[PDB]
Write an enzyme that holds these catalytic residues in place. Structure first.
Site, short mmCIF file in Angstrom:
data_model
loop_
_atom_site.label_atom_id
_atom_site.label_comp_id
_atom_site.label_asym_id
_atom_site.label_seq_id
_atom_site.Cartn_x
_atom_site.Cartn_y
_atom_site.Cartn_z
N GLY A 1 -14.95 -4.27 -5.06
CA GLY A 1 -15.47 -3.09 -4.59
C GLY A 1 -14.85 -2.02 -5.42
N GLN B 1 -10.74 6.23 -7.79
CA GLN B 1 -10.13 5.19 -8.95
C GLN B 1 -10.60 5.63 -10.09
OE1 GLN B 1 -11.23 1.53 -6.35
NE2 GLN B 1 -9.20 1.01 -7.54
N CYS C 1 -5.63 -4.76 -5.98
CA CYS C 1 -6.16 -3.72 -6.21
C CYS C 1 -6.17 -3.27 -8.10
CB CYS C 1 -5.51 -2.36 -5.79
SG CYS C 1 -6.35 -0.97 -5.73
N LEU C 2 -7.38 -2.95 -8.36
CA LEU C 2 -7.40 -2.43 -9.68
C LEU C 2 -6.58 -1.34 -10.27
CD1 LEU C 2 -11.27 -2.94 -10.35
CD2 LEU C 2 -9.50 -4.67 -10.68
N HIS D 1 -10.41 -1.69 2.64
CA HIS D 1 -9.70 -1.21 1.30
C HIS D 1 -10.29 -0.12 0.52
CE1 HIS D 1 -7.46 -2.76 -2.04
NE2 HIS D 1 -8.28 -2.15 -2.88
N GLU D 2 -11.55 -0.19 0.55
CA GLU D 2 -12.22 1.00 -0.31
C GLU D 2 -12.00 2.35 0.68
OE1 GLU D 2 -12.82 0.36 -3.08
OE2 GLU D 2 -12.87 -1.84 -3.16
N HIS E 1 -9.01 4.12 -0.22
CA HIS E 1 -9.13 4.99 -1.38
C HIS E 1 -9.55 6.31 -1.04
CE1 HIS E 1 -7.51 2.24 -4.38
NE2 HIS E 1 -8.65 1.14 -3.90
C1 LIG Z 1 -9.72 -7.85 -0.88
C2 LIG Z 1 -9.61 -6.55 -0.62
C3 LIG Z 1 -9.78 -5.65 -2.10
C4 LIG Z 1 -11.23 -5.65 -2.49
C5 LIG Z 1 -11.28 -4.73 -3.66
C6 LIG Z 1 -10.41 -4.96 -5.02
C7 LIG Z 1 -10.86 -3.98 -5.97
C8 LIG Z 1 -10.38 -2.60 -5.79
O1 LIG Z 1 -9.22 -2.35 -6.22
N1 LIG Z 1 -10.97 -2.10 -5.04
O2 LIG Z 1 -10.68 -0.73 -4.85
C9 LIG Z 1 -10.71 -6.40 -5.36
O3 LIG Z 1 -11.57 -6.63 -5.61
N2 LIG Z 1 -9.47 -7.08 -5.32
C10 LIG Z 1 -9.59 -8.60 -5.46
C11 LIG Z 1 -8.82 -9.47 -4.46
O4 LIG Z 1 -7.97 -8.92 -3.87
N3 LIG Z 1 -9.56 -10.43 -4.38
C12 LIG Z 1 -10.41 -11.35 -4.93
C13 LIG Z 1 -10.59 -12.54 -4.28
C14 LIG Z 1 -9.68 -12.56 -3.00
C15 LIG Z 1 -8.77 -11.57 -3.47
C16 LIG Z 1 -7.16 -11.96 -3.63
O5 LIG Z 1 -6.64 -12.46 -2.59
C17 LIG Z 1 -8.94 -8.77 -6.92
C18 LIG Z 1 -9.89 -8.37 -8.22
C19 LIG Z 1 -7.60 -7.83 -7.01
ZN LIG Z 2 -8.50 -0.99 -4.71
#
Ligand SMILES: CCCCC[C@H](CC(=O)NO)C(=O)N[C@H](C(=O)N1CCC[C@H]1CO)C(C)C
Ligand SMILES: [Zn+2]
Ligand SMILES: CCCCC[C@H](CC(=O)NO)C(=O)N[C@H](C(=O)N1CCC[C@H]1CO)C(C)C
Ligand SMILES: [Zn+2]
Lengths: 167, 167
Positions: free
Chosen positions: B47, B52, B97-98, B139-140, B143
């Protein structure tokens, strides 16, 4: 003197409680102290704690614009430290940690502490510190009781990446 | 579709409260949504929220082993979201989080939420989500109200760098 890897936050070794040093003035202890200073100097740190290089012992070293009033403190080796916190005066300031690379956060510390312990020869150390000196000692002591500075932060709006906070 | 820079924690824009979108189905809004999907896809995110990429508007997008029971949710654009939290069931899970690159932390979330709002055409959205789906939406949404996940963490012994936590 060799440069050792600094462990990063997430490594469970940084959360352990360091054990006391029992034998002073040994070649092994001098080697550790020398390795710590080489590692600290290389990363341009103001202090280092032995758990940060994977050594679970009560050993800290320190010595060194955000604190322009701070006098220089000569390099110090402090083993089995005993801290005394001096309430009530606290100060906020920015901290970074070699185990938390790329970040800074605002942390409240005691303005003044007493610290005692021993150097690597077994000689007693006993001092009162204030300001940045007191802050460095608190930060390194925290490493010996399993604490990294994000655990001390209460205002996470002032925690972030150095490149963004201070461009 | 262009890839926009993702702001990092420390940037005060991530702490602001996003303003609502007032006009739907405009070329400007479609461009933002397209840029967000390109940016999210490029970073392999589940997401993304408009703050962001420096856009202070209530726009979130999402769509996608740690949550192997999670069904796939098609890409969603959610504008001016209204969340309903469903106590008491909470779940802990790892998040990254990115805007906090290189780190993970354990965060408690509601197991289930309702969310409503509008897509970029002004069509109503109204859903109940659970598990990872509910976690991504929370999470989103955070933000949009100035919250990054370290502000939600209560156990900072489970916060650290991905390379060390998950080698
Ligand atoms: C889970 C809650 C966060 C979802 C959104 C985030 C991306 C983000 O910063 N959104 O604002 C994401 O994809 N995060 C991923 C993430 O946290 N993941 C991907 C699979 C499982 C989990 C890591 O435990 C990675 C890319 C960092
Ligand atoms: Zn995030
Ligand atoms: C201040 C309390 C921390 C002192 C020790 C740390 C080093 C460390 O991780 N010790 O365990 C340090 O030198 N940190 C430096 C630091 O925080 N500084 C250096 C000057 C001012 C301040 C940044 O605001 C940099 C190198 C990250
Ligand atoms: Zn440190």
């Amino acid at each position: 003197h060799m440069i050792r890897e600094i462990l990063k936050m997430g490594d469970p070794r940084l959360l352990e409680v360091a054990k006391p040093v029992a034998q002073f003035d040994t070649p092994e202890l001098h080697e550790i102290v020398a390795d710590m200073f080489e590692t600290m100097h290389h990363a341009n740190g103001a202090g280092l704690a032995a758990p940060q290089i994977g050594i679970g012992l009560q050993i800290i070293i320190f010595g060194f614009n955000r604190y322009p009033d701070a006098p220089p403190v000569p390099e110090t080796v402090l083993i089995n430290p005993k801290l005394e916190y001096m309430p009530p005066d606290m100060e906020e300031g920015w901290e970074g940690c070699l185990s938390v690379p790329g970040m800074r956060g605002v942390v409240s510390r005691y303005a003044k502490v007493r610290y005692s312990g021993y150097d690597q020869f077994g000689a007693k150390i006993d001092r009162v510190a204030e300001g940045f000196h007191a802050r460095v000692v608190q930060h390194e002591y925290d490493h010996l009781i399993g604490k990294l500075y994000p655990m001390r932060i209460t205002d996470f709006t002032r925690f972030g990446f150095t490149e963004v906070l201070f461009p």
